[PDB]
Amino acid sequence: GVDIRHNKDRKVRRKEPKSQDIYLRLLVKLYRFLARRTNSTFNQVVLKRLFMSRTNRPPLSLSRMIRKMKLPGREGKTAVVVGTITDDVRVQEVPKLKVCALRVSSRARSRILKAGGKILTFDQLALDSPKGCGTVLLSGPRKGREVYRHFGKAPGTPHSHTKPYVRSKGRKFERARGRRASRGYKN
Amino acid sequence: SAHLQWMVVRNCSSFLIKRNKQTYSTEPNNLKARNSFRYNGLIHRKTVGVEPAADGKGVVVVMKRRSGQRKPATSYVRTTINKNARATLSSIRHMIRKNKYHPDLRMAAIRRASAILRSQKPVMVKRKRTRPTKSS
Amino acid sequence: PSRLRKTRKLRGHVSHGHGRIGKHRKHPGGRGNAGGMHHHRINFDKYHPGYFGKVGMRHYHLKRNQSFCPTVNLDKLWTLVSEQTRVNAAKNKTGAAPIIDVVRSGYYKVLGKGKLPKQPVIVKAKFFSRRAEEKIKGVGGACVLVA
Amino acid sequence: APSRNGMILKPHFHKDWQRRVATWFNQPARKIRRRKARQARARRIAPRPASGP
Amino acid sequence: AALRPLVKPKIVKKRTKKFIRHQSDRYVKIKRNWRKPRGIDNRVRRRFKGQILMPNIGYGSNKKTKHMLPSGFRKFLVHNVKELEVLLMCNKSYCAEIAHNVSSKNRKAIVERAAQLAIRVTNPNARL
Amino acid sequence: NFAELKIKRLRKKFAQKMLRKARRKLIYEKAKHYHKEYRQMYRTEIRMARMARKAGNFYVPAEPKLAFVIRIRGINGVSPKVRKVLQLLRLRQIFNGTFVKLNKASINMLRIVEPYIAWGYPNLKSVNELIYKRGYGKINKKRIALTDNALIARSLGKYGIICMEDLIHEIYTVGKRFKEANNFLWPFKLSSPRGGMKKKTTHFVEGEDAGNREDQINRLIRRMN
RNA sequence: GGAGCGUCGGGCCCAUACCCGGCCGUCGCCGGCAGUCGAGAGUGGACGGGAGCGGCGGGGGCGGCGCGCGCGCGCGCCCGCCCCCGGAGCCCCGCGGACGCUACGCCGCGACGAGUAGGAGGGCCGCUGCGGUGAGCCUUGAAGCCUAGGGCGCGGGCCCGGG
RNA sequence: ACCCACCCGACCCGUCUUGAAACACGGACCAAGGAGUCUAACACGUGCGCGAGUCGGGGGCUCGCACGAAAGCCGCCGUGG
RNA sequence: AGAGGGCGUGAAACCGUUAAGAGGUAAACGGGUGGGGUCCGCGCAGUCCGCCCGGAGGAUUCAACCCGGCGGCGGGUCCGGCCGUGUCGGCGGCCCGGCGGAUCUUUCCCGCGCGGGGGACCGUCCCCCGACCGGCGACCGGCCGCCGCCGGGCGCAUUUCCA
Numbered sequence A: 001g002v003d004i005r006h007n008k009d010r011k012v013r014r015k016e017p018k019s020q021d022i023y024l025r026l027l028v029k030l031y032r033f034l035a036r037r038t039n040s041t042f043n044q045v046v047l048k049r050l051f052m053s054r055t056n057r058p059p060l061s062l063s064r065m066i067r068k069m070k071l072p073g074r075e076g077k078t079a080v081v082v083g084t085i086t087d088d089v090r091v092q093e094v095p096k097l098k099v100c101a102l103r104v105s106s107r108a109r110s111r112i113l114k115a116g117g118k119i120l121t122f123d124q125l126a127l128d129s130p131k132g133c134g135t136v137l138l139s140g141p142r143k144g145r146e147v148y149r150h151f152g153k154a155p156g157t158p159h160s161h162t163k164p165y166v167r168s169k170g171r172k173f174e175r176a177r178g179r180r181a182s183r184g185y186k187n
Numbered sequence B: 001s002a003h004l005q006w007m008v009v010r011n012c013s014s015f016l017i018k019r020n021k022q023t024y025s026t027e028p029n030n031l032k033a034r035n036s037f038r039y040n041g042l043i044h045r046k047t048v049g050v051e052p053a054a055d056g057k058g059v060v061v062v063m064k065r066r067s068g069q070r071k072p073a074t075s076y077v078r079t080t081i082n083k084n085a086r087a088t089l090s091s092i093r094h095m096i097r098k099n100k101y102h103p104d105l106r107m108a109a110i111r112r113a114s115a116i117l118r119s120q121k122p123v124m125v126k127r128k129r130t131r132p133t134k135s136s
Numbered sequence C: 001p002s003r004l005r006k007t008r009k010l011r012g013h014v015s016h017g018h019g020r021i022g023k024h025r026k027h028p029g030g031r032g033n034a035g036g037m038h039h040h041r042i043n044f045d046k047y048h049p050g051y052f053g054k055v056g057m058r059h060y061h062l063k064r065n066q067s068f069c070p071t072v073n074l075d076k077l078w079t080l081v082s083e084q085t086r087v088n089a090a091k092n093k094t095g096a097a098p099i100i101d102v103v104r105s106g107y108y109k110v111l112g113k114g115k116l117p118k119q120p121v122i123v124k125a126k127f128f129s130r131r132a133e134e135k136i137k138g139v140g141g142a143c144v145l146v147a
Numbered sequence D: 001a002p003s004r005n006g007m008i009l010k011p012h013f014h015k016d017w018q019r020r021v022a023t024w025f026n027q028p029a030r031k032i033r034r035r036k037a038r039q040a041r042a043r044r045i046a047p048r049p050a051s052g053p
Numbered sequence E: 001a002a003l004r005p006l007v008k009p010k011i012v013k014k015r016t017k018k019f020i021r022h023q024s025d026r027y028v029k030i031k032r033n034w035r036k037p038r039g040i041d042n043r044v045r046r047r048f049k050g051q052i053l054m055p056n057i058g059y060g061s062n063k064k065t066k067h068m069l070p071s072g073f074r075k076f077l078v079h080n081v082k083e084l085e086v087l088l089m090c091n092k093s094y095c096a097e098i099a100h101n102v103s104s105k106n107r108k109a110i111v112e113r114a115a116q117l118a119i120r121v122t123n124p125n126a127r128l
Numbered sequence F: 001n002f003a004e005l006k007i008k009r010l011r012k013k014f015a016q017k018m019l020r021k022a023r024r025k026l027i028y029e030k031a032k033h034y035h036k037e038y039r040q041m042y043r044t045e046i047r048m049a050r051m052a053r054k055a056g057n058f059y060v061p062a063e064p065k066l067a068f069v070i071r072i073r074g075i076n077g078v079s080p081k082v083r084k085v086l087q088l089l090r091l092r093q094i095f096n097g098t099f100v101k102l103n104k105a106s107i108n109m110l111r112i113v114e115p116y117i118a119w120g121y122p123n124l125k126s127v128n129e130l131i132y133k134r135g136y137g138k139i140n141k142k143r144i145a146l147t148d149n150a151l152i153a154r155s156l157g158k159y160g161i162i163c164m165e166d167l168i169h170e171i172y173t174v175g176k177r178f179k180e181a182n183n184f185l186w187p188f189k190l191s192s193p194r195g196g197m198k199k200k201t202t203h204f205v206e207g208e209d210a211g212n213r214e215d216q217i218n219r220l221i222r223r224m225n
Numbered sequence G: 001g002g003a004g005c006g007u008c009g010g011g012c013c014c015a016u017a018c019c020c021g022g023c024c025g026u027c028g029c030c031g032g033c034a035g036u037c038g039a040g041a042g043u044g045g046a047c048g049g050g051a052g053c054g055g056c057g058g059g060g061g062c063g064g065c066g067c068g069c070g071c072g073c074g075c076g077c078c079c080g081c082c083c084c085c086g087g088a089g090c091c092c093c094g095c096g097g098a099c100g101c102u103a104c105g106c107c108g109c110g111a112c113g114a115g116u117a118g119g120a121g122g123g124c125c126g127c128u129g130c131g132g133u134g135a136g137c138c139u140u141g142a143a144g145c146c147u148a149g150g151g152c153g154c155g156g157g158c159c160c161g162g163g
Numbered sequence H: 001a002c003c004c005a006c007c008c009g010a011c012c013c014g015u016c017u018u019g020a021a022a023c024a025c026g027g028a029c030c031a032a033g034g035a036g037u038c039u040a041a042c043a044c045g046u047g048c049g050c051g052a053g054u055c056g057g058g059g060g061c062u063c064g065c066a067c068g069a070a071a072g073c074c075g076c077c078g079u080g081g
Numbered sequence I: 001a002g003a004g005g006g007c008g009u010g011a012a013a014c015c016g017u018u019a020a021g022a023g024g025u026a027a028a029c030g031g032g033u034g035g036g037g038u039c040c041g042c043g044c045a046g047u048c049c050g051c052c053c054g055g056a057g058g059a060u061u062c063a064a065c066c067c068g069g070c071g072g073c074g075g076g077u078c079c080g081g082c083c084g085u086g087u088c089g090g091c092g093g094c095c096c097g098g099c100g101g102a103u104c105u106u107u108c109c110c111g112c113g114c115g116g117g118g119g120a121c122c123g124u125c126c127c128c129c130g131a132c133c134g135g136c137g138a139c140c141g142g143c144c145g146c147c148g149c150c151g152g153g154c155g156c157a158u159u160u161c162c163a
């Protein structure tokens, strides 16, 4: 008899993508290979991200991709995003970029290409740079989802600012006993 | 591609046959009857297939062109080899090795031809061997 | 797809995943939102702060269309018009400034979030913010009230 | 009984509602019937607009 | 002089008797078919000394010889002639079973074809 | 192209074979030295006492540096403070053992697990027999048997420890690099004590097997190793 | 003259505990393999001038960074070569690559494996009906039924023989 | 795998229970039947499509529906959510 | 009629008999052997096959080679032409290229400041040839090399078959 807890012996990370789609799965076959045979950890990070959920690979807006490449020095590079590239209607002038993405929305595609931008697929990125050399690996804001505003220290727990799940906002949906001082108390 | 359409097909094709813990595949120009990527007639730009001759004597090799698949009518190109066993193999060998065509296959293609030339063994001889038929 | 659901995997086991000390009885709490004050209170006042109690003024024959006032931010004002108004402008050389009827596009108020590009406008709208006005003037434009 | 976070929600299934469920298996059959009846009315008002007035 | 398989190793089995179901002996209503007991007290399900055994993955077969018939082959249930020609390139490792439902005319047609290709049949001398 | 490369590859081949020879010779001389070192250590303890004894004097030799610690009772119903220390000595299973350098900290940790272990001061031979018969590396967290020095070197060679012999000298003299050589060794899975024990549950002093038995840990080692 | 009681020896007895080995599963390994040299790896390769038995004349270190299977060499004859795998013949081969590669595949190393309530995963486990699909099976005998017949699977179960 | 013998092991299941072989209940035997369903609402997770949008209803245009009460299309494509 | 008028199939409980075996600790069960039965596989030697080789017998036409024909592959000279990506030149399709636009013009036209259609303009989609480059599985034609098949040649130290 041995004393170990077998409690957290199984690591819960993903191995493959849970999706069954065939084009992504080909990318996975390609980046598994590169991951293992190259020294590049870029390939490993990319590989890891191909297995993740929709939630877990959030969309990267065009404006966010602009400003991250506006940063000093990462000039004449390629931005990479395992998610999708979306438009920003609240940005106007779009520099000529180099981009990798699993998806780019039709607007975002036009705007970039009109600028003299190049768009790449991930099979194309590999041939272009199999060890991820000269890349900017970005990500969309993970904690964008409105979901997260309900997460945390519960509402009605002093110093929480945590959206309650409520049928409809309005004068008479919550905001009585436990928010006003006038009505019982407040947190 | 080859790989893309293998993704579509791997588990669903009419030619496949699971059952009894094995799997197999019945698509034509698959030597080794495997549901493999390697050994699949329909998928690959260049294909080998070693069937027996309809005569009952000999073997047919079945190359695929590259010229134009899209046009299956014209795509495969058959060729009977009805020669002295040892020769038959060598002709297949050269077809495969010295044309640099499907080099991966080739030894499987030889064994198939070999087994086919075994088939055309003698049925009567086998019957004699199994039963002694002596003194009732 | 019953095939996939959990009761298929519970077949054979006695309690059906509801335990055997305590069981699956009918309504052990009370039905629904029963006990909001008594005996379910803690859940109510740690996930629904402010359920209980009145507040504010009644309003008898509310009709929502009276208070209709959809807003738009400067952020994306140029979105209302075709790019070639914003292009034939930063060009032209008359110092023209194209009109943007915001009420046509379905927004009544113009509030002031965001940077407006240095490029004159005439914004026609039912209502404006203070800041939205200011930003518009700073671009070298003119806010315009409409009924 | 409520369990840790969720909309304290009021469904309106306390009356005998299953006595008054109204299915829509008609609707295709309906949609046709209107459409026939429509084409008939056109044909009756011969060169007059199908529209109406 | 029957068809020898390619490799005829020693199959070695961990357990030979069927695991039978608790109290299948006592009652005609209970069938031998294994069932794990889920009873709160249960001699068997709590592994007492002297009781009927519970199947585990412990008893598992060695992967080399799992599904290996005594003869050395694995079955493959052939259904008609066309279905045989699969085994052509195995024959030394898989044999052909013919199905129960196949007719005594075309049972014959299969058997002689398998005899050309040297695929061993596991129920040939039968229908007649 | 061809004959130039071939000779370059043959040259490479040779330069390896030379180096292999060299490192082998180092190993051989390192042992020979350690043979002389242990000899010198043994005699020069006797030397001392005889010289005290010549005078009306005493030679109190050094208190021991290093001790082997065998877990001699099982893994049921064991107090949480004990249990923690037992898994700070890596003594998880029953009849696992470890070398342990002694000091005020370490000794007291053994004091808190006394009726759970048998321990004491191992011989030279004990350190050899344990290392050669049951010497297993921790090599990418896989218990792997020390079949060659290529294993020891690969892991401990950044300390000057390049062979089984070096390892034995680091363990036995409790060198600078003891912590790292001792942790490299996977804890010693020894069999049951042949000829049995005296009594599991009681201390050595009082007839049983537990606790410090100092010299006599070596007898126990032989009947278990 | 213990087969009693107190003190102590040797010796022997056996648990699912410990050790070694087999086999099954699970976990872990930034695990390996989409076809390459390489085992404390501590380089490889142009290419130009100047030359050659020269070399890089550094620690009782006991040694790792440098040395004795060649660097230049045997052949063509001091000068030239030091050549190409469609052929070096291979323990490594960078020219092309499994018997192997259903990449949801295949392979290797370690570790571990009680379980109610409860949870999750996988079931080429099982039932009935639908779209597809098996140039499936079936009066030369389907379903069901029965079987001291033959087997497979850890098991749910399954397949064959005879009736 | 059928029967028999012998050595060792071995109390009857289900269940509520801190505790069941119990002098605790249910159970003579066999067959068939027999219990976590569906709708609605919410939340989180996951898969797919599109993405500052998205959406399909409801309605309409295309057929006697064999398959269709499907399928397709709509400045209704967005009244509206 | 092993379908006989409540009759297709005809399970289990339960009963009758026939056969076999057992029998003082209720039976039944798990593990482990033994004995007997039932069938099943044999063998009237199972010495099991397959390569290659050496010898010994017997028998057909070759292979190796050229020659003629067919088909296939691969290649570069991209040689010649079709083919299409990125770029530049034609402002050439632009009216013989259409849609879209809150871009413009009511110098226009038609219908009643508005609707429809022109006409500018911008965005997008197509012709002409030249140049550079990815020369891309997107194809043809010749030439080359290699492979395979058929038929010609080769009659036997060969190449087959068989024992």
Ligand SMILES: [Mg+2]
Pocket: A006
């Ligand atoms: Mg556990």
Ligand SMILES: [Mg+2]
Pocket: C017, C018
């Ligand atoms: Mg539950």
Ligand SMILES: [Mg+2]
Pocket: C014, C015, C019, C020, C023
């Ligand atoms: Mg219950």
Ligand SMILES: [Mg+2]
Pocket: C022, C023
């Ligand atoms: Mg409860």
Ligand SMILES: [Mg+2]
Pocket: D051, D052
């Ligand atoms: Mg109307």
Ligand SMILES: [Mg+2]
Pocket: E040, E041
């Ligand atoms: Mg209990």
Ligand SMILES: [Mg+2]
Pocket: F076, F077
């Ligand atoms: Mg205890």
Ligand SMILES: [Mg+2]
Pocket: F201
């Ligand atoms: Mg105690």
Ligand SMILES: [Mg+2]
Pocket: none
């Ligand atoms: Mg377990």
Ligand SMILES: [Mg+2]
Pocket: C013
């Ligand atoms: Mg349970």
Ligand SMILES: [Mg+2]
Pocket: none
């Ligand atoms: Mg109770």
Ligand SMILES: [Mg+2]
Pocket: H017
């Ligand atoms: Mg009680």
Ligand SMILES: [Mg+2]
Pocket: E041, H020
């Ligand atoms: Mg009980």
Ligand SMILES: [Mg+2]
Pocket: H022, H023
């Ligand atoms: Mg009692």
Ligand SMILES: [Mg+2]
Pocket: H025
């Ligand atoms: Mg009761």
Ligand SMILES: [Mg+2]
Pocket: H027
């Ligand atoms: Mg009763």
